[PDB]
Design an enzyme around this catalytic site. Structure first.
Site, mmCIF file in Angstrom:
data_model
loop_
_atom_site.group_PDB
_atom_site.id
_atom_site.type_symbol
_atom_site.label_atom_id
_atom_site.label_comp_id
_atom_site.label_asym_id
_atom_site.label_seq_id
_atom_site.Cartn_x
_atom_site.Cartn_y
_atom_site.Cartn_z
ATOM 1 N N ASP A 101 2.975 -7.858 2.747
ATOM 2 C CA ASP A 101 3.964 -8.921 2.949
ATOM 3 C C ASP A 101 4.694 -8.697 4.269
ATOM 4 O OD1 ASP A 101 5.840 -10.871 2.797
ATOM 5 O OD2 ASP A 101 7.010 -9.942 1.173
ATOM 6 N N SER B 29 6.658 -21.492 17.844
ATOM 7 C CA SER B 29 5.496 -22.323 18.126
ATOM 8 C C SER B 29 5.859 -23.398 19.135
ATOM 9 C CB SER B 29 4.996 -22.967 16.828
ATOM 10 O OG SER B 29 3.944 -23.880 17.064
#
EC number: 3.4.23.22
Length: 330
Positions: free
Chosen positions: A35, A199
């Site tokens: 994770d 992004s």
């Protein structure tokens, strides 16, 4: 040193991925959920409330000649999905894919919430976010990657998750046969303890690319792709009959649909998520309403590049002095 381990979807939907991990002496192998959105290595154990164990493999520290109680240390964690666990702490030897750390903090669960009990395939979590998020008190502990870093050939790990197929976590090296083209690296902020990046935009299907900054986290422990409501609406508007369902908890779409792809930007590069990766199947057995793999982050407080996004790429988690992320097509 290096390590390399195969990671395998827990079910036919890729709801999560499990990677075998050796703990203790002799080794006890548990299948952990790696994770990159958390920083605790915790396991079902011989200490876990018996009624909260239902099929998981447990760590028994009393059977490990290298286990030592970390005196006074406790831990307690709550995840973004509402699940939680807590317990005490041992140090022990932990190996992943041939890479060994001695003295790793292994957080032994005394209590786990129902969603953990109900998932017999996940024996615990192995956190790979920054150690500043580790919950052990009163002495915060380091992640497996942090403990291994200095010994690794290169201070990196990579995630290569499969679509409906196994993939690979590598530590200490970049497998240049595992991706196509070049790896595009992008800046990371560690201020929230995550692999947080920006992004450069998105496209839906064959549509034009929208240049827009989307700050979010690379999180292998989250199944879906969670993005701003504007982006998510633009995606689902291209699917006839798709709608946001308050009763289901997100966007659903007719199971008869063919989904468009979704592209996200990494600098000037582009990662294409095929439409099939966005299908999470019937909302309930036999339903013709299917659950979408792109969902709004509006209620989370952060955008999350979960497995739906990451499995479309070869992803480098670069733990150099200034961390960065790398993405390549594959």
């Amino acid at each position: 040193s290096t390590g390399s381990a195969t990671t395998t979807p827990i079910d036919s939907l890729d709801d999560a991925y499990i990677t075998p991990v050796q703990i203790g002496t002799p080794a006890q192998t548990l299948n952990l959920d790696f994770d990159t959105g958390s920083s605790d290595l915790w396991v079902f154990s011989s200490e876990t409330t018996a009624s909260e164990v239902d099929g998981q493999t447990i760590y028994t520290p009393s059977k490990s000649t290298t286990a030592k109680l970390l005196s006074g240390a406790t831990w307690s964690i709550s995840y973004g999905d509402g699940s939680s666990s807590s317990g005490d702490v041992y140090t022990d030897t932990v190996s992943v894919g041939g890479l060994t750390v001695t003295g790793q903090a292994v957080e032994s669960a005394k209590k786990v919430s129902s969603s953990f009990t109900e998932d017999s395939t996940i024996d615990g979590l192995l956190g790979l976010a920054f150690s500043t998020l580790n919950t052990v008190s009163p002495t915060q502990q380091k992640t497996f990657f942090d403990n291994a870093k200095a010994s690794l050939d290169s201070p990196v790990f990579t995630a290569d998750l499969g679509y409906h197929a196994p993939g690979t976590y590598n530590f200490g090296f970049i497998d240049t046969t595992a991706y196509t083209g070049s790896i595009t690296y992008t800046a990371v902020s560690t201020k929230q303890g995550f692999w947080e990046w920006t992004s450069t935009g998105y496209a839906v299907g064959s549509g034009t690319f929208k240049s827009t900054s989307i700050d979010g986290i690379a999180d292998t422990g989250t199944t879906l792709l969670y993005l701003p409501a504007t982006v998510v609406s633009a995606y689902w508007a291209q699917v006839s009959g798709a709608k946001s369902s308050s009763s289901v908890g997100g966007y659903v779409f007719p199971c008869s649909a063919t989904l468009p792809s979704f592209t996200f930007g990494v600098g000037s590069a582009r990662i294409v998520i095929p439409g099939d990766y966005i299908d999470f199947g019937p909302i309930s057995t036999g339903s013709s309403s299917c659950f979408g793999g792109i969902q709004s982050s509006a209620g989370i407080g952060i955008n999350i590049f979960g497995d739906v996004a990451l499995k479309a790429a070869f992803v480098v988690f670069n733990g150099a002095t200034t961390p960065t992320l790398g993405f390549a097509s594959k």
